[PDB]
Amino acid sequence: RWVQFMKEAGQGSRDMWRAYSDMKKANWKNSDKYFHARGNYDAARRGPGGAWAAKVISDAREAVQKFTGHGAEDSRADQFANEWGRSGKDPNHFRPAGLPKRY
């Protein structure tokens, strides 16, 4: 169903929001790739709709970041982490040392 896909998309959107919210609450140096990967990883594991939402949201954020002057290298690196998580690879490969266990 389109309904089931959309439900997955809604949940994946929530996952993406949580990664952003946790990133902000954590204030941890060089943690953004971890949180980029984690949100995409969580969302894609909701199902196809979740993977779709993760991609659509990732792509919008990359666009807004570019507009603000984010460098091409940093954007590419962020997109690498996004796709890493979304494909099911462990977000913890981007985990900075000492990031609290709750994240």
Ligand X SMILES: CCCCCCCCCCO[C@@H]1O[C@H](CO)[C@@H](O[C@H]2O[C@H](CO)[C@@H](O)[C@H](O)[C@H]2O)[C@H](O)[C@H]1O
Q: Which residues bind ligand X (CB under 6 A)?
A: 10, 13-14, 17, 56-57, 59-60, 62-64, 79
Distance CA 57, CA 13 (A): 8
For the CB of residue 28, give the shortest distance to its own copies in the complex, in Å: 18
CA distances from 99 to 30, 35, 60, 69, 95 (A): 10, 11, 27, 28, 7
Nearest residue (CB) to its own copies, 6 versus 74: 6
Least Cα distance to 85 among 27, 18, 49, 33 occurs for 33
Residues at the contact surface with its own copies, assessed by CB under 8 A:
2-3, 5-7, 10, 13-14, 17, 20-21, 48-49, 51-52, 55-57, 59-61, 63-69
